[PDB]
């Protein structure tokens with residue numbers, strides 16, 4: 001079927017509290033074809049030790065996938081998600097918007 | 101960097117004609133990820149199948165399982181049809197009852 005471009009959402013598991021351990025998630029949804037690269041970024045730099053869900057799909061072959069890592073937020077630190085996919089020219093970055 | 105799937109077909113318990121079992125097609129070790137899988141009662145594509153999710157290694161080798169509840173009979177015969185890029189022609193694999 002026809003190509004389609006991922007929806008990308010970045011969120012913490014519990015609400016932020018500086019210096020308290022949390023998890024950071026990057027949820028990539030709705031996309032096709034399946035092949036995709038995902039990386040999480042502490043101040044523009046690629047976190048080593050990340051974990052991920054399996055890659056699941058609908059009857060209509062939309063794919064869904066989750067990346068996450070334990071982390072401790074601080075006032076100075078800035079976190080984001082870098083996705084590359086065919087439907088993206090340029091690897092797309094999306095910031096973690098704290099204030100929600 | 102391409103890799104062709106390993107394909108294994110097996111029942112969960114040993115065959116017993118007219119007793120309910122599960123049939124699995126396990127497709128392993130493959131890349132890239134895109135792949136079609138179907139199970140076949142006498143060459144015909146079974147409607148109501150289930151599947152695991154698609155998991156992968158650090159290596160980006162992918163792993164996936166299809167299965168269905170079924171009742172085997174002496175004359176019935178079952179198989180798995182996989183299509184992948186690395187295959188010229190969709191590959192079929194039989195279920196050997198005497199696994």
Ligand SMILES: Cc1ccc2c(c1)sc(-c1ccc(N(C)C)cc1)[n+]2C
Nearest residue numbers: 008009010011012013025026027100
């Ligand atoms: C079925 C299910 C289970 C969990 C679950 C969802 C759906 S959807 C979701 C979630 C998605 C996005 C966000 N942010 C972008 C703030 C926060 C939470 N969770 C955590």
Ligand SMILES: Cc1ccc2c(c1)sc(-c1ccc(N(C)C)cc1)[n+]2C
Nearest residue numbers: 053054055056057058059064065066
């Ligand atoms: C319409 C439709 C069909 C299937 C389907 C969805 C939507 S959304 C989804 C899904 C699967 C796994 C995950 N995580 C790994 C947490 C999150 C979402 N599935 C499996």
Ligand SMILES: Cc1ccc2c(c1)sc(-c1ccc(N(C)C)cc1)[n+]2C
Nearest residue numbers: 108109110111112113114115126199
């Ligand atoms: C009755 C009977 C006899 C042999 C037999 C089975 C049932 S089920 C089975 C088997 C084959 C492959 C796998 N994996 C690759 C996960 C798991 C189990 N064997 C080898």
